[PDB]
Design a protein around this nucleic acid. Structure first.
Lengths: 52, 94, 180, 166
RNA sequence: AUUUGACCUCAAAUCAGGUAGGACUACGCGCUGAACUCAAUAAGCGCAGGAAAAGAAAAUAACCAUGAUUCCCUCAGUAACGGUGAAGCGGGAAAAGCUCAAAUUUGAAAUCUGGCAACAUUUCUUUUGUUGUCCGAGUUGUAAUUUCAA
RNA sequence: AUUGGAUAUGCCAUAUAAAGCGCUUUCGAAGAGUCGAGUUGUUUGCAGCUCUAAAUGGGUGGUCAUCUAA
């Protein structure tokens, strides 16, 4: 084994921003959270917003 | 003409006269160093190939004299630089 | 022989700390010196302006600050560069003037503002040069009215002529010198 | 100043006076040792313009080396090895004959206080200047290894730089 | 005759005070250098440091000109050579400039090591200096001014 | 317990001086067996050897431009 194996991988910035935007949109959906495994049965509202 | 092509090609701006740079001066002949060069000249003499050039020039065989001078030094400009100097010494001796 | 880059984040962090240490050590003054506006020396980049090494003696003298004190107040001096056009001259001159106008000098020995100093110096603050002196690019020409003599002027017809003049310049250069 | 006259006379090496002096001096150094102390430099103008001052701490050694690598560099290395408590400042050609070239090497005693208190030569006391003549940091050393400024004057090729992201 | 004193050269001292060796070697600078382009590699030899080396143009350019060195991306696998293989420019990291010889202080060697005696000071009774006095170095040039940007 | 740099404060210093800036009615010293040439050797650069320079001269780039080596 050598140290100059390709350890890091380059991702396009637009692809990264696409994934992050989809991840936020996914977090704003109740059903995806239940599949994720979060016990949010009695969470009052999704997306959840709290004051400053 | 403010043009990209031509013998005066390039942009046109207001040209400024640059101040004189002292390192451009080197090669000038100061009066004091010229005097000192005179003193060492009269106290040291001339090299053996110079003496041969005196003999060659006093015999008036200038072609061979410049040919051997170029052979001794290596460049035609140095050979000419020698010749004018030793002829200049020649009329001074005369 | 291979050169691996596994210390790239480490080098980046070390450089940032060195900048931070430099700023802490010499905080009263900006961490970057003033730099002159200079044009690249080629046909491919002569349309841009970048930061030169330092100002010249002619620019320093025209601005009124001596080459001796210029280093002390933070104005780098380049003894090799020379100004071949006034356009660059007053350009770098006005860079220094705005620098000096925004410059405040703390009096030495803290006894009195001897000639060139600042009376009130409590407003000290470390700010970068780029904010006060933002280096710009070559001025982009704005819309201008149609010029009639230029309209009659063809264009590359001339570039063909002065080109043909340039290529055969030696041809007529011979012609005149041989017939004269 | 007489050093101008000394310098201008040193230019003309084929002069009758220079030829006679060189032969007599070269003969004298022959039955002298291969490396021997010279209490006063034979070319004071050359020594001064090379960095030698007539003060306690500067040492002049004369060395003869046979002809037929750079003789000036070899002379500096041998003198430096022969005087191990001295830093080789510079060296200069003084004489030559059919087979022997003669050089004078200027050395400085870093342990002497007249050197350690002089700000114009204090740089040589630092340990980075031990055996400059052997590492190739003298005038003839730099010229021999080709150190210069210009297009006329390796590790960047034999390596293949592999960046993190590629 | 010859005795006395100088200068020059060269010796001797278990003279006073210092310094060099050897080791480590990953990185650094040189010398040298094969064989199966290999490779200015491995081996051999010399020499340092915390970095070393390089460094303030006897530099690029042919532009509206750039402006010490080093490193990185790019130039570019291009020019070039017959597989080898750059550099200028451009973008960054970092920036800091200088010192001598060459000219008379001639109304004044103004310079400096060492010995002796005090005064001190300390990472330190362990360090580093100051003054006075003597001898010496030094006019075959030590100080101050000048380094071409002038 | 050390220090590194600044601030306030006290005491010595000796300026009969030194330095920067604008002008010249002035002069402007600048590195030699070194550059360079021929030849042999090493990967233009370097070295050995024959020979050996100049002072608006010398080096570099295609009369001009830029630098000022030893």
């Amino acid at each position: 084994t050598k140290t100059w194996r390709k350890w890091h991988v380059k991702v396009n910035q637009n692809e990264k921003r696409y994934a992050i935007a989809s991840a936020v949109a996914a977090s704003g959906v109740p059903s995806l959270l239940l599949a994720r495994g979060h016990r949010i049965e009695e969470i009052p509202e999704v997306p959840l917003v709290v004051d400053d | 003409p403010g043009l990209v092509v031509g013998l005066n090609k390039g942009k046109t701006l207001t040209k400024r006269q640059l101040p004189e740079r002292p390192s451009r001066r080197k090669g000038h002949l100061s009066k004091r160093t010229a005097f000192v060069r005179s003193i060492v000249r009269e106290v040291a003499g001339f090299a053996p190939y110079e003496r041969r050039v005196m003999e060659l020039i006093r015999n008036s065989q200038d072609k061979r004299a410049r040919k051997l001078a170029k052979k001794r030094l290596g460049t035609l400009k140095r050979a000419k630089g020698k010749i004018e100097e030793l002829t200049s010494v020649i009329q001074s001796s005369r | 022989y291979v050169k691996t880059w596994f210390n790239q984040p480490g080098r980046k962090l070390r450089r940032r700390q060195a900048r931070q240490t430099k700023a802490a050590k010499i905080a009263p003054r900006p961490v970057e010196a003033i730099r002159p506006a200079v044009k690249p020396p080629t046909i491919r980049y002569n349309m841009k302006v970048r930061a030169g090494r330092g100002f010249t003696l002619e620019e320093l003298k025209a601005a009124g600050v001596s080459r001796r004190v210029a280093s002390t107040i933070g104005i780098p001096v380049d003894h090799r560069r020379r100004n071949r056009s006034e356009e660059s001259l007053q350009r770098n001159v006005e860079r220094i003037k705005v620098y000096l106008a925004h410059l405040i000098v703390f009096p030495r020995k803290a006894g009195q503002p001897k000639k060139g100093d600042a009376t009130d110096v409590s407003g000290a603050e470390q700010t970068d040069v780029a904010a006060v002196l933002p280096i710009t690019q070559e001025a982009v020409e704005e819309a201008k009215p149609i010029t009639e003599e230029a309209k009659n002027f063809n264009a590359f017809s001339t570039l063909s002529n002065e080109r043909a003049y340039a290529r055969y310049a030696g041809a007529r250069a011979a012609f005149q010198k041989k017939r004269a | 100043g007489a050093y101008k006259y000394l310098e201008e006379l040193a230019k003309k090496k084929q002069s009758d006076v220079n030829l006679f002096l060189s032969r007599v001096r070269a003969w004298e150094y022959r039955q002298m040792n291969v490396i021997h102390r010279a209490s006063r430099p034979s070319r004071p103008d050359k020594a001064r313009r090379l960095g030698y001052k007539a003060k306690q701490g500067y040492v002049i050694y004369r060395i003869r080396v046979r002809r037929g690598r750079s003789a000036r560099c070899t002379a500096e290395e041998r003198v430096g090895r022969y005087c191990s408590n001295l830093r080789v400042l510079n060296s200069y050609w003084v004489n030559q004959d059919a087979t022997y070239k003669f050089f004078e090497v200027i050395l400085v005693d870093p342990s002497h206080k007249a050197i350690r208190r002089d700000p114009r030569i204090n740089w040589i006391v630092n340990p980075v200047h031990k055996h400059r003549e052997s590492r190739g940091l003298t005038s003839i050393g730099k010229k021999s290894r080709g150190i210069g400024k210009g297009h006329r004057f390796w590790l960047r090729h034999n390596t293949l730089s592999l960046r993190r992201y590629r």
